[PDB]
Amino acid sequence: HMNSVTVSHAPYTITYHNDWEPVMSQLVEFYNEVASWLLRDETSPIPDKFFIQLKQPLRNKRVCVCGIDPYPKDGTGVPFESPNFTKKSIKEIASSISRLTGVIDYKGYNLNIIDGVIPWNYYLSCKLGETKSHAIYWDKISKLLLQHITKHVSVLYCLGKTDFSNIRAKLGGGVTTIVGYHPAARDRQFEKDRSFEIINVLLELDNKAPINWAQGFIY
Amino acid sequence: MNSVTVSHAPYTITYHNDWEPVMSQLVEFYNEVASWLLRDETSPIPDKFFIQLKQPLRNKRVCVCGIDPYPKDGTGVPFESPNFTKKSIKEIASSISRLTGVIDYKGYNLNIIDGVIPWNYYLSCKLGETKSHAIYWDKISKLLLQHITKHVSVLYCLGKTDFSNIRAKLGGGVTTIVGYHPAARDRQFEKDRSFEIINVLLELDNKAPINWAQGFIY
C-alpha cells in the first residue's frame, strides 16, 4: 500500500502509506517552503530519514507516543529508537516497561514494533546537538501531521510537561490527550509515572484492545 | 474567603483563596460580556452564577463537568436537584447505587463529596434554552477550567455531543474522560463505566479514591 511524491529538495523522494494521502499535498507544499533553510544545518536525523515514519499504516494504530523532536544526535528517523540502546530516553522507557511487565533480561526496546502504537516526533529534525532548534521550520507541518494522526488514534501520549505545556486538547473528539514527564527528566518522576497503564485503562474504557508493551523488547 | 467587585449584576463575586490567580482576568472578561448576557432571563440567576467559586480547589482531585446549567431552576450548583426529579442526577444516583451497593436513598448531590467539584463549563443559559450563552462565557470558561485542571487529577465531562467542539490547555497532570450525557434517552447510562473507572485512574496517579456514597441523601 505504498506511494511516492517528490519534493524539490533533499530527500527529493518521500515514501508514504495510503493512510497519509489526505495530507501529502500540503506536506510537499510546506516542506518546499522551508527545506532550503533547514538543510543548511546538519541535522538529526539525516534528510533521508526525515519522513520514514510515513511508511506506517495509521488505521491499525490506536495510540500515539509523541516526543517534541529527534535526539540531538544519532536520530534514525524512528522516534526514540536507539540501535545500540544508549539514549537515556528509550532506556528509561524500557526500565518502566521492565518493572511493569516483569521482563528483566533484554537487549533493547523499540516503540515502533508494538502493535497499535506509532511513536512520533512533533518536529521532524533538529540542528545537530540542539533540541527544538528547528521548530520554526517544522511548525506548520507539525500541526498538519499530528492533527492527521489524532484522526486515527484514541490516545495521544506526550512526553515532556514543559515541551507540551501549551498543547490544546480536544475533549469530546474521541481522542484523549495525556502529557507525562519526560523520561530523561529529573528526580525520577518519570519512573513513578504510570502513564503506560493509564493508556490501557483508557483504551479498554473506549472498548479498544489494550497495548502489549512487552512487544517493544529486543532480545 | 475573598471578594471582588464587577460593574453589572451580581456586582460582587465571593471566592475561596485557591481561585485568586484567576480573579483578575475573570472580572475583566465578565465586564466585557455581562451587559449582553444579562438582557436575557438566566438559569441560574445572576447571583448564583459563581457560587462554585466558594469551593476549595487544593483538596479536589476529580472534576465532574457539564456543558452549561439546566435551562430551568438552576441553583449555581451543577447537577444539583433539590426535589430530586431531574433525570440527570437520578441516572447518576442509579449508577452510583450499583457501584456502591447503596439501595435506599431519597436524593444525591455531587457537591457534598470529598475530592469532587461539580462544574458547568458555561456558567449560564437563557431560561428555557440549552447552550444559548456559549458566546458570552467562552473566554471565562477556558480560564476557569484551565485553573481547575491545575488541581484535579481526573476530568469527567458528561455529554459527548456537548463537548465535541471544546478545546482546552489541560497541561498536567490531568486525565480526561468524556462520557454520554446521563439524561440521554437513546443511551443506557447503566452501561457507562466512567464513574467506576475514575477510582482506577486515581489509583494509577497515586491518589486516594472518591467515596461516591457521600453523595447520597437519606
User: Would you state the torsion angle of the CA atoms of residues A150, A153, A157, A163, taken in this order, to the nearest 10 degrees?
Assistant: -20
Residue appearing with cell numbers 488505521:
A59
Q: Which of B111, B89, B74 is nearest to B182 (CA)?
A: B89
E strand segments, chain B? 2-5, 12-15, 42-43, 62-66, 107-108, 116-120, 125-126, 154-158, 167-168, 175-179, 216-217
Rounded distance between C-alpha atoms, residue B28 and residue B124, angstroms: 18
The residues of A annotated as belonging to the active site are 69
Selected for mutation to probe chain A from B67, B150, B153, B167 (highest A CB count within 10 Å) is: B167
Cell digits for A39?
538543510
CB neighbours of residue A37 within 10 Å: 12
Rounded distance between C-alpha atoms, residue A133 and residue A155, angstroms: 27
Q: Give φ, ψ of A148 to 5 degrees.
A: -65, -40
Rounded distance between C-alpha atoms, residue B3 and residue B54, angstroms: 10
Tell me the nearest-neighbour CA distance from B170 into chain A, angstroms.
7
Under 8 Å between Cβ of A145 and A30: no
Cα A17 → chain centroid: 16
Residues of A in contact with B122 (CB under 8 A): none
Rounded distance between C-alpha atoms, residue B60 and residue B58, angstroms: 6
CB burial of residue B157 (10 Å; 0-12, 13-18, 19+): buried
Nearest-5° Cα angle at A154, A153 to A157:
85
Tell me the nearest-neighbour CA distance from B3 into chain A, angstroms.
30
Q: Within 13 Å, how many C-alpha atoms sit on residue A119's CB side? A: 22
Rounded distance between C-alpha atoms, residue B177 and residue A61, angstroms: 20
Cell digits for B123?
456558567
Nearest-5° Cα angle at B105, B104 to B109:
150
Q: Give φ, ψ of B189 to 5 degrees.
A: -65, -15
CB burial of residue B11 (10 Å; 0-12, 13-18, 19+): exposed
Identify the experimental approach: X-ray
Residue appearing with cell numbers 446521563:
B182
**DSSP state letter for A117:** E
Domain that holds residue A7: 1-219
Identify the helix (H) or strand (E) that includes residue B63: strand B62-66
B-side interface with A, Cβ within 8 Å?
A: 155, 157, 160-178, 193-194, 197, 200-201, 204-206
Cell digits for A156?
495521544
Q: Which of B26, B28, B14 is nearest to B147 (CA)?
A: B26
Identify the helix (H) or strand (E) that includes residue B148: helix B134-148
β-bridge partners, A155: A63, A176
Residue A63 sits in a domain whose CATH number is 3.40.470.10
Query: Strand A108-109 and strand A176-180: pairing?
Result: unpaired
Q: CA nearest B191 in A: which residue? A: A205
Task: Indicate the number of domains in chain B.
Answer: 1
Of the candidates A165, A169, A202, the beta carbon closest to that of B168 is on A169
Identify the three-state secondary structure at position A169: strand
β-bridge partners, A4: A15
Q: Could you give the C-alpha distances from A12 to A35, A76, A126, in angstroms and in order?
A: 10, 18, 19
Cell digits for B113?
463529596
Residues of A in contact with B170 (CB under 8 A): 167, 169, 177, 179
Q: Which of A201, A157, A146 is nearest to A179 (CA)?
A: A157
Q: Hey, what amino acid is at A180?
A: G
Identify the three-state secondary structure at position B4: strand
In our burial notation (b when 16+ CB lie closer than 10 A, e otherwise), range B39-52 reads: ebebbbbbebbbbb
Under an 8 A CB cutoff, do B176 and A171 touch? Answer: yes
Identify the helix (H) or strand (E) that includes residue B107: strand B107-108
Rounded distance between C-alpha atoms, residue B169 and residue A169, angstroms: 6
A-side interface with B, Cβ within 8 Å?
A: 161, 165-173, 176-179, 192, 194, 197-198, 201-202, 205
